[PDB]
Amino acid sequence: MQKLIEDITKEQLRTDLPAFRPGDTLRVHVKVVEGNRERIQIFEGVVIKRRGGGISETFTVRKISYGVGVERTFPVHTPKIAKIEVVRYGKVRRAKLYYLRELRGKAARIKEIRR
Amino acid sequence: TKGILGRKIGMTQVFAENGDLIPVTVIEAAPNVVLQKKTAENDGYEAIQLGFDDKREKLSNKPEKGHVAKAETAPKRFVKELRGVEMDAYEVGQEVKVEIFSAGEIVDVTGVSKGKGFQGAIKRHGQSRGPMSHGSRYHRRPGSMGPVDPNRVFKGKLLPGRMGGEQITVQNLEIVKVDAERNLLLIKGNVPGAKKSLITVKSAVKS
Amino acid sequence: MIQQETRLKVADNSGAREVLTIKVLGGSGRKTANIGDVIVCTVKQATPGGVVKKGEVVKAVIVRTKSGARRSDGSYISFDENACVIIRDDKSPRGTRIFGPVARELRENNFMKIVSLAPEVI
Amino acid sequence: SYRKLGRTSAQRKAMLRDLTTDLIINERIETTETRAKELRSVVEKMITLGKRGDLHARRQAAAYIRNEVANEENNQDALQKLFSDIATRYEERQGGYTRIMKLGPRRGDGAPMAIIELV
Amino acid sequence: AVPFRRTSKMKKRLRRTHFKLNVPGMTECPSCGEMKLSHRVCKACGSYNGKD
RNA sequence: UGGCACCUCGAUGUCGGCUCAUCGCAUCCUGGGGCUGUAGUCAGUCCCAAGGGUUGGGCUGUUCGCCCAUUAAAGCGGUACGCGAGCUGGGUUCAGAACGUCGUGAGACAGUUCGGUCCCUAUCCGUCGCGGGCGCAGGAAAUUUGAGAGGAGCUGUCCUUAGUACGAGAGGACCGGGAUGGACGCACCGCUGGUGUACCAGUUGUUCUGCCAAGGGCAUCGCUGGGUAGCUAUGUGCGGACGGGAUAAGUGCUGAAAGCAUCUAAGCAUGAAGCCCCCCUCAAGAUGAGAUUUCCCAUUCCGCAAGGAAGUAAGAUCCCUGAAAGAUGAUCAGGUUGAUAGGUCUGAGGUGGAAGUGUGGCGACACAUGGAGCUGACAGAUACUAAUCGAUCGAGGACUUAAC
Ligand SMILES: [K+]
Ligand SMILES: [K+]
Ligand SMILES: [Mg+2]
Ligand SMILES: [Mg+2]
Ligand SMILES: [Mg+2]
Ligand SMILES: [Mg+2]
Ligand SMILES: [Mg+2]
Ligand SMILES: [Mg+2]
Ligand SMILES: [Mg+2]
Ligand SMILES: [Mg+2]
Ligand SMILES: [Mg+2]
Ligand SMILES: [Mg+2]
Ligand SMILES: [Mg+2]
Ligand SMILES: [Mg+2]
Ligand SMILES: [Mg+2]
Ligand SMILES: [Mg+2]
Ligand SMILES: [Mg+2]
Ligand SMILES: [Zn+2]
Secondary structure, rough: OHHHHHHHHHHHHHHHHOOOOOOOOOEEEEEEEEEOOOOEEEEEEEEEEEOHHHHOEEEEEEEEEEEEEEEEEOOOOOOOOEEEEEEEEEEEEEEEOHHHOOOOHHHHHOOOOOO | EEEEEEEEEEEEEEEOOOOOEEEEEEEOOOOEEEEEOOOOOOOOOOOOEEEEOOOOOOOHHHHHHHHOOOOOOOEEEEEEEEOOOOOOOOOOOOOOOOOHOOOOOOEEEEEEEEEEEOOOOOOOOOOOOOOOOOOOOOOOOOOOOOOOOOOOOOOOOOEEEOOOOEEEEEEEEEEEEOOOOOOOEEOOOOOOOOOOOEEEEEEOOOO | OOOOOOOEEEOOOOOEEEEEEEEEEEOOOOEEEEEOOEEEEEEEEEEEEEEEEOOOEEEEEEEOOOOOOEEOOOOOOEEEOOOOEEEEOOOOOOOOOOOOEEOHHHOOOOOOOHHHHEEOOO | OOOOOOOOHHHHHHHHHHHHHHHHHHOOOEEHHHHHHHHHHHHHHHHHHHHHHHHHHHHHOOOOOOOOOOOOOOOOHHHHHHHHHHHHHHOOOOOOOOEEEEEEEEEOOOOOEEEEEEO | OOOOOOOOOHHHHHHHHOOOOOOOOEEEOOOOOOOOOOOOOOOOOOEEEOOO
């Protein structure tokens, strides 16, 4: 990585976000803005992917909503996330949990690992 | 018309105040030096000659050193001209710095596109392939060379050949941030050329 | 990315279960539709005794896609299926209930009835 | 990037492992200039393992070095010599354990030949 | 495709202009005095950078 | 559709489709207008206009045509009914077989049907790219002007003007602002993805490293889950914007010839997506070989001169380390007062918790040591290795006139 780009983007990196890994369950408090007014919408799901480095790092959270799985991908350091809570620490064996895309119900469970 | 020479450092992204995520290209422009002012009287046209990126003495030759002697500066690796500039606002030896631009300003960016070597009609000219199955033996070929009547191929029948490495201008890019301390320009979007390649940032000609 | 021959689930109770995309509207050579775009489609599977019947040519709006949609803030949303809602020309749905989550993008395209009816608008 | 040396991946890996053990045993071999240039990086990274000396490093090297006798009198294998003689020789040298010296073209195919040896 | 007309002796010779060899890039070996190729070890005496 | 039989029977391969286009205008859309039995919205017809654009399917070998769904529009023709040494080979007209029908028959069509070998290594011109030589009145290093050439040229919907003008209502503007798309093009890999055969991990069979443990070979990279650089689109940024000049059809002003009238004869305007520019790219071999800045400096030989030869200057090359470049040349970054590549060290990203040991379990295995170990191309640092010594090329500037 170039050292210059790290310095330029350093100010905009967020420092309050908790450490989490693929497999953990997160409540992402997303600042939804419909114009003048903004309302925090919570998206709770499993972290299935976390790629990239520095200011360009992103992560993907997956949940089943009304029978349909939904995945949301966010920039890790985006100011549009108000807060992230790690609800649960999951025991997984790989960085990308793509296999969860084909599973549903009991097959899609992630073992907990008390941190 | 404003302009400055710089090196392409790479791309990253920046969050705007309203939360938008803007991709930016980082251009590093150590202060340029005005090496020569050309005039209509002496040269037939008005232009400013900017030197950029001080070259090691060993790499510079004697003709170069003499040319930059009047500006009282180290030899420069990259020399370019700018036309359309306010001649009176510039003096030989003056340093041109990134702070001539400001955030939000619209600029054109010139560079040499990355080379791709010898490329076929499909890649080089975005032509269509033939069928891949149903007996086809025509896949990545450049198509009929033309009608029979002329007994020759018309000029401009596009064919394989060396691709990339041409001078290319992208117009109407926005300056996102000017880091005077580090001599950086953050320009929204991407610009031609490989990393470390010379980039020219001028005030937009369509403004 | 919905195109001709794409089959979609229907996310309402109009009577159609599955539709096949006939045409993506909104420009001469337009190849692909995304969330919020209106398509012409035929009803391939229908619920017996529904308002819409098998073999009808209807208009629908795409409310979910696997490809999903990128947002200005740099986030994305994807779903595991492609679903649409049968609509009239005034953009009201022809059914009365919407099933499953729908994307926020429908508010931008003024499908307000669908958004209000959806069990979740993400 | 890296060179393919006109061989598939499996053949190329096999040749590079052969050359490495050959160079460890003899400390100097003549080969084609391009083969020598590729060998350089491979062998030097093996020498780094020898300098580390720990069992984990040794097993990484054991996975690469061919099982060939380096010195019949002691019954010393290439891997033992690597850890016991090569590493000891270059304990205080930071990188650059080999040098390439170019010979003329080889008769028969005009191949540019080279000497590669431990420095 | 086959040649429509034979090639003249002039056209043949004009083509072969660039079909040429170059003199080798020689430099005297300062140790033994034999000529070697620049940047190659001397075959004759085995010297390089003033070392055998 | 024909008439003729002038070229081709020591061979000018066919219909349809595919790839690639190019031209005409008798204009399908977009632009500008006259007339209207043009209220408005729409239209009809004629004129100017070829800049750009001009869809995806069902049926059929099909062209065509009908149909489905769109579009601003789904234009008409020429180019050997453009394009088979560019592709396909479904139709048709080789050999097989069959039906109907005709024939005494072999067989045949006034009809069908199933199956049936598409050869060629590009010499020349042409076309797209890349070099070497010389030239351009000294020898070099850079920066450039632009004669000239190429590229681009498309358009929808919505909001506002305004439910205004218009109309009895129904409906519903011009012009002028503003937003956002489709198709198309350029660039780029930060984002979303693809690839990633010298990256990480899991796992099957068998064989090998003496055995255990840990590993290697082979099985499509054995298979499977990820993935760095690079290359990428379906991803992202941007473009066709503002306008000038001269015009077309048209509209005119002043104005006689011809006391009036008249756009025209003198004279003065206006007026198109079109023309010339503006915008992008190439461009001095533009032999008319241009211009500017800087550097080198008048050497040594001979010959009566003309001129020739030899060392060099500035500078460049050979050779060497390479990649941001690349088929090869070339281009670019470097060649020891050098970070050019490799290695080494420190990182990033990637994988996902190494081996050894200990503990828990009868065991498979789990946990701790420990975000561990490993890591191709990415970043920074570091002369440890290789860029040695050398060789080759490269000016001394013609004559005439004019002004100094
Ligand atoms: K009969
Ligand atoms: K990418
Ligand atoms: Mg990561
Ligand atoms: Mg094939
Ligand atoms: Mg001709
Ligand atoms: Mg194999
Ligand atoms: Mg006759
Ligand atoms: Mg003949
Ligand atoms: Mg013939
Ligand atoms: Mg006409
Ligand atoms: Mg034809
Ligand atoms: Mg032909
Ligand atoms: Mg056929
Ligand atoms: Mg010819
Ligand atoms: Mg990258
Ligand atoms: Mg075992
Ligand atoms: Mg075998
Ligand atoms: Zn010698």
